[PDB]
Design a protein around this ligand. Sequence first.
Ligand SMILES: Cc1cc2c(cc1C)N(C[C@H](O)[C@H](O)[C@H](O)COP(=O)(O)OP(=O)(O)OC[C@H]1O[C@@H](n3cnc4c(N)ncnc43)[C@H](O)[C@@H]1O)c1[nH]c(=O)[nH]c(=O)c1N2
Ligand SMILES: Cc1cc2c(cc1C)N(C[C@H](O)[C@H](O)[C@H](O)COP(=O)(O)OP(=O)(O)OC[C@H]1O[C@@H](n3cnc4c(N)ncnc43)[C@H](O)[C@@H]1O)c1[nH]c(=O)[nH]c(=O)c1N2
Ligand SMILES: Cc1cc2c(cc1C)N(C[C@H](O)[C@H](O)[C@H](O)COP(=O)(O)OP(=O)(O)OC[C@H]1O[C@@H](n3cnc4c(N)ncnc43)[C@H](O)[C@@H]1O)c1[nH]c(=O)[nH]c(=O)c1N2
Ligand SMILES: Cc1cc2c(cc1C)N(C[C@H](O)[C@H](O)[C@H](O)COP(=O)(O)OP(=O)(O)OC[C@H]1O[C@@H](n3cnc4c(N)ncnc43)[C@H](O)[C@@H]1O)c1[nH]c(=O)[nH]c(=O)c1N2
Lengths: 382, 383, 382, 383
Amino acid sequence: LTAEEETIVKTVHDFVEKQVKPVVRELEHANTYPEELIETMKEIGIFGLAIPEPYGFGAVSMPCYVQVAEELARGWMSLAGAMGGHTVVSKLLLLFGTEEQKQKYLPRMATGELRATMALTEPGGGSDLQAMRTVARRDGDDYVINGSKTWISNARRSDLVALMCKTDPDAQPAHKGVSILLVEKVPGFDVSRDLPKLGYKGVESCELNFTDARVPVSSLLGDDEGRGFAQMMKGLEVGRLQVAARATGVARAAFEDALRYSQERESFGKPIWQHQSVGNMLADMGTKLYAARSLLLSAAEKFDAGQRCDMEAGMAKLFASETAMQIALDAVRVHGGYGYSTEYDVERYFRDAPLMIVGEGTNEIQRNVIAKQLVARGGLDI
Amino acid sequence: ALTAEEETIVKTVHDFVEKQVKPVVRELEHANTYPEELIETMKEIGIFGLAIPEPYGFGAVSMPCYVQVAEELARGWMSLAGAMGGHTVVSKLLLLFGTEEQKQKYLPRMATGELRATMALTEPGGGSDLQAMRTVARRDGDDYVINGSKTWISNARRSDLVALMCKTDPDAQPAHKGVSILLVEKVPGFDVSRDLPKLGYKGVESCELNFTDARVPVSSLLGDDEGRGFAQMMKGLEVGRLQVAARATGVARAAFEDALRYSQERESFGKPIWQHQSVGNMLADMGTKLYAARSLLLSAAEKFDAGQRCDMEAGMAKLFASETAMQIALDAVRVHGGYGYSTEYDVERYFRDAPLMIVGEGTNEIQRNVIAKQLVARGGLDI
Amino acid sequence: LTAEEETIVKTVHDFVEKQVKPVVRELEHANTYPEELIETMKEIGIFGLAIPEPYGFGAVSMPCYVQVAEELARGWMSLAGAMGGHTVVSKLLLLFGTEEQKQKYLPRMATGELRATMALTEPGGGSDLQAMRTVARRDGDDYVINGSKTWISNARRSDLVALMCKTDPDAQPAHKGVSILLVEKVPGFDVSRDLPKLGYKGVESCELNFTDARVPVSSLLGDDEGRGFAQMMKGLEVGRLQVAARATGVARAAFEDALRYSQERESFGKPIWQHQSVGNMLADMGTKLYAARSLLLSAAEKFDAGQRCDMEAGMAKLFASETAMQIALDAVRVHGGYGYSTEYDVERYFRDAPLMIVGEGTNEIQRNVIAKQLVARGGLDI
Amino acid sequence: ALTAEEETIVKTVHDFVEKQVKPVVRELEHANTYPEELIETMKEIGIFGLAIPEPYGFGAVSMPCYVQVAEELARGWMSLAGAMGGHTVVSKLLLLFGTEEQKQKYLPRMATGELRATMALTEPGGGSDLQAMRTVARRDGDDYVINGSKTWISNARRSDLVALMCKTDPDAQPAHKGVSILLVEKVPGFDVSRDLPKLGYKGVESCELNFTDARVPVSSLLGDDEGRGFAQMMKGLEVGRLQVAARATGVARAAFEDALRYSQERESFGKPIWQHQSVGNMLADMGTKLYAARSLLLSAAEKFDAGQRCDMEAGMAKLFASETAMQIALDAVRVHGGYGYSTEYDVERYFRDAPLMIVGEGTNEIQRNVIAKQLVARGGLDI
Ligand SMILES: Cc1cc2c(cc1C)N(C[C@H](O)[C@H](O)[C@H](O)COP(=O)(O)OP(=O)(O)OC[C@H]1O[C@@H](n3cnc4c(N)ncnc43)[C@H](O)[C@@H]1O)c1[nH]c(=O)[nH]c(=O)c1N2
Ligand SMILES: Cc1cc2c(cc1C)N(C[C@H](O)[C@H](O)[C@H](O)COP(=O)(O)OP(=O)(O)OC[C@H]1O[C@@H](n3cnc4c(N)ncnc43)[C@H](O)[C@@H]1O)c1[nH]c(=O)[nH]c(=O)c1N2
Ligand SMILES: Cc1cc2c(cc1C)N(C[C@H](O)[C@H](O)[C@H](O)COP(=O)(O)OP(=O)(O)OC[C@H]1O[C@@H](n3cnc4c(N)ncnc43)[C@H](O)[C@@H]1O)c1[nH]c(=O)[nH]c(=O)c1N2
Ligand SMILES: Cc1cc2c(cc1C)N(C[C@H](O)[C@H](O)[C@H](O)COP(=O)(O)OP(=O)(O)OC[C@H]1O[C@@H](n3cnc4c(N)ncnc43)[C@H](O)[C@@H]1O)c1[nH]c(=O)[nH]c(=O)c1N2
């Protein structure tokens, strides 16, 4: 990384060590929205990491970005979650947005004055998006939106929502009917309920209801209707990389606590790491985490070099997310009974890890996508 | 075969779980509310007397029946099985090792649940390395004077008899011959100090205990001789490991049932999700492992009951079932997709409860050590 | 088990200890057909374990049967393989055969004078049997058979082959066109080639070619054409149980060698089992093997009690077969470098284990079948 | 970035594998035939001089290039990478620790393959517990007199220089300071006793060595001082672990390629088998793990080359890649169904070769022990 990029990663690490870690336990326990921490994140530039001049201060490299996201997640997964969707919307705007849209939204998004999130998932399905029921019917110079979404993260605090919806529910082929609309908080758009979650606490995830919600037709992302799927798929290069960084972040936290505790707790006359059963866990955890970060960093470099990286980003997400779950459980084992205590942090990492497996696209879907990609590519890029 | 009465008790407990436990468990468990009404119904059912024969109680069910009762309870809510586990182990220790006076003093009120008991072994400085324990009981006239501390003691507040493993001779040679078990009532100097906040196993309290100059009569000693605490506990761990294995198969049954049901209710891409191989494969693996774990458990319970050696088999049951329940709990979350993460669904609770049987009822690392040594002592499996 | 059944299991165990184990290494290495050992197996009654009076001495209980098969496999998997298909054909004859067929074949099968095997698999597919190309066209009082099978075990030494084939390739629905024929070694039926295998050595597995091979129409198993699938599916209750017993057998052998070696080999001043890394493997191996046998024995009892046991038999096969593979590799680990030497037996168990995973129906298919069964049943039988 | 010449060498080795190795490997490997022609072509290519710089040889490639060459070789046939592994490690030990005389005596003929070297550490009594080794070298005038035995020594017959770890002072205090490495030629008393029959790694011999009153000059000592054998070997194990990791990723690449190709050629139930999720999922998991393992390997190779600490990272690469190759090899067998079991297909060979990198190049149990200790010494990962 360049010195400027190294400095950014260090500022975030120091932010996590000095500001996040002292307060996270109490806030996460009470499901308190971390306003002060988020505000500091806006000040250091977290909400503009993908936004270049003239709209923002500059788009850091993807290797820098994943390190930032990892550092945040290592302190508290929810903080990285607070900017994940926002970064994806940023990227979608840059790739596909009109000049007017980019100009309208990107400058305030970069400071975090305006936050954005992604609304794809419907109550009837998050995987089978083609079956979605949310429609956007053209009426004069407006779309009239009727439907619902759920599990939408940061939905209350985000005043721009990238809504995947059916601009033509009767299109043939059906993919021509699906678009992305950039939807502000207009009448008829209700953020109807906060959903109670195992982990990812502090950040709200919500049901959305649209009852004849009118938005200008200029809300369309890009010039053409029916590009929503192709657009999303490109968005997922960044999405999958950030989720993977979230997972290596949670894994780092759990591994660090486990390794530290194994030196401080003794049994049968020695530090517990010197029992092979515990040392073996530490060796496996560290080795898999090194593999996971190595893969992540490799995928990020491919992204940065402008090479095809869609499969690689997916593999990063699959591997890191499964790895973080394994590491989290083993960190609990290393603490013995104290692993089960809410006065230690490992139980929280254990609660947080599944989010990246089931709640950021599923890993079953991710495997299906990787298999298709392997066949298309003919193997790994070696 | 289970006797008539034994089949009936299992059914009664299943019905209690379906009609009384399941409709209130979310609210109680989420609020960490002590389930006083549910536990009282368990007392009436006879749950606290399952190992207590006549003349003290209304009959000791077979071990295969006992594990099925524990499994049914845990299927509804792991914590309700936890409520009676240590009590059962103490019941057994009294029968195996107690004087006639002790058995008569405690077992009749234990069988009804009027008196509850728990086991206190774990110290803040270690639950595995018990030889290093600091709790001491020193003879002074016809009392023991107890000083020290224990922690993670389940049901310590609601239990008014505690089987306390402590050093009656800290200078013993060999050192393991200095450890005994005392049956300690709630005497002056015995403080039940605080409820420890936990990931799961909610509703049931686990506590730190502090003993300051706590006087009990020397008749509190379990058995006639000091220095047999470890031997006695080993024998108690046969019951303990089987009951923990049953907790784990019960939690597994609950997670698996929910996942299988959900996989038929939820559809994607035009069909019930079980018909996608990625999901159907998880169900097949879950169901297959669960069948393996219950088969192992029931085999070990029958060996216990046939009077055959079952110490290794009980540890195997605990190890296999607890690891299996954790695997099944996670996969049940996966089957639910995003809803697996919601506390309005039950699979997140099983996921939070499953690690308890792995790290908090003796650890699985210690359990493998014990099994390796037993395999060598035995020369392999009993075949 | 009854005393008679205990005695049978003991006779086989003693046969394995006294006769098999001294010679297996040299024979298996050279792919030598174990004629003497097979002949002894005929003499002790292995080929009539499922054949009742009046045709044979008696059908042992399924719990007895799985213990016999396990004992054989523990000495050498190939020996249990030599009687597996034969037992299934025995069972198919008893369940579905005419009185004439049963009388013709079962008495000689019970002594092993006549051996039988199952021929389902085609070169084009062993899983997708409905797509099979082998046809049996009626011409007068004969079927004329044209096609091919492959991976047919014991095909040279078996003079009766239960051939799944299409008696009506145009049937609608297509399952009405599939039958089982009991085919003797007639002209036009070539056992064309022996296939070289990783393990399962000593026993031949062959390609079969049928070129206008004529058999009497009385060769049909049962009175009706188009019952082949339903018949096979019933045959697989016994098939899956025997394969599961083969796996627990190989697992017992590998575990026993590993446990023994861990007491006899020392490093850093002590027997290697006392290193937790090795002890942990032994504990896991023993525990999983106990689970596997417990499940197997439970499924066998259900079979014997006449309760539905099809899912259970499949679960037994899946679990035991995966377990034996895991145990075999770990037995190799326990031996260190000597695990890799062909002068020790663990490499052979390692080569043999995959057979039960890929070569006795696949475990992927087995999982699909179990999922369907779980949905049909509504869960486990508890 | 790889230099021009470095990219070219990798391509040359890939082409050699595709055109020369693959068409003959089955017949040779099945017959345990020493691949003399293939190895001779490897000599001409420069394979035996990859770590030997000027003035001794035509240049030491970077470590990232080296691992890619080793991986390409192993992809074709694990045994061909094995043929040059120990030779590379000895090359490095000579460069790090040898006198000018030793370097000049051996490295020029080593670089061409005219002289081959191997490492002899493992004893019949143990390959892990090397401190317990029985091979001794006792000074007598200006000779060492060597007595003892080694086993599993790869390429012992074809290699005419053996780096022998032995006790120059069996009474040393501390005991580890009695162990040295001697560069031993094929002298009277040094018997290469027999080729050990193996599950895989065929074509290349592994042998028992027996030393009886075997005299070598004292100048055979690697370095100026006795008692540094363990320290020197640790340094050599950086190269050794990286090369073994590369063998494992190479074998994995071969198994994965075959499985992916087969999954497109074979159809069932109306489609290419990859389109059944059970198969596609295996491919996704295989490809994902392989990518992880190669990423880790290349990261560790770059650290080596940047002069950064890489001792833990090399062990991690070996552990992860070897376990990954075994998993991928089995799943490739599964993908082929029954044909996976046929010796007319190649996946059975990868399956037989993969355990070598787990149990026979230091064990993975020892490797985890080493990694745990390193993690503690370091305080975690280098991040
Ligand atoms: C909610 C709840 C409820 C209860 C309990 C726990 C919890 C969490 N337990 C306490 C429980 O039995 C205890 O946690 C375990 O004995 C493990 O103890 P430590 O936490 O001290 O692990 P400890 O500090 O011993 O071990 C930490 C880690 O090192 C490992 N380790 C330690 N020594 C080792 C060795 N020699 N070899 C290999 N690995 C080794 C452990 O396996 C673990 O991974 C208890 N107790 C009680 O007495 N009565 C009760 O009612 C309950 N109930
Ligand atoms: C806390 C939190 C936060 C968020 C989100 C979730 C959660 C829990 N998500 C929603 C998330 O992406 C969603 O849960 C997943 O897409 C999975 O969707 P379903 O729950 O609908 O699984 P679904 O019902 O699709 O699947 C259920 C199970 O079946 C499997 N399955 C389904 N179809 C299959 C197939 N064809 N093949 C194989 N297996 C198949 C799945 O893998 C899963 O195991 C979200 N969404 C969003 O739009 N914006 C957001 O901000 C967030 N944030
Ligand atoms: C084909 C082939 C080729 C070669 C070699 C092997 C093979 C099979 N090796 C030998 C190889 O390095 C050796 O096998 C390993 O060092 C393991 O040694 P043992 O077989 O003596 O295992 P050992 O007897 O040390 O161990 C047996 C089991 O116990 C475990 N164990 C032992 N001590 C332990 C501890 N303290 N803690 C935890 N677990 C422990 C091991 O991990 C293993 O599971 C070799 N050598 C050489 O010098 N030069 C060469 O060229 C080759 N090449
Ligand atoms: C040594 C030996 C001995 C015997 C046999 C094999 C071998 C190797 N078998 C044949 C064996 O039963 C056969 O190999 C299996 O049925 C698998 O068949 P294919 O190899 O055709 O796999 P196939 O080509 O069907 O499958 C290839 C891969 O795709 C997977 N797959 C295929 N369809 C799928 C689907 N719908 N969903 C998910 N995954 C799917 C498979 O699981 C496998 O991983 C046999 N047969 C016989 O009739 N008589 C005998 O005596 C013997 N004995």
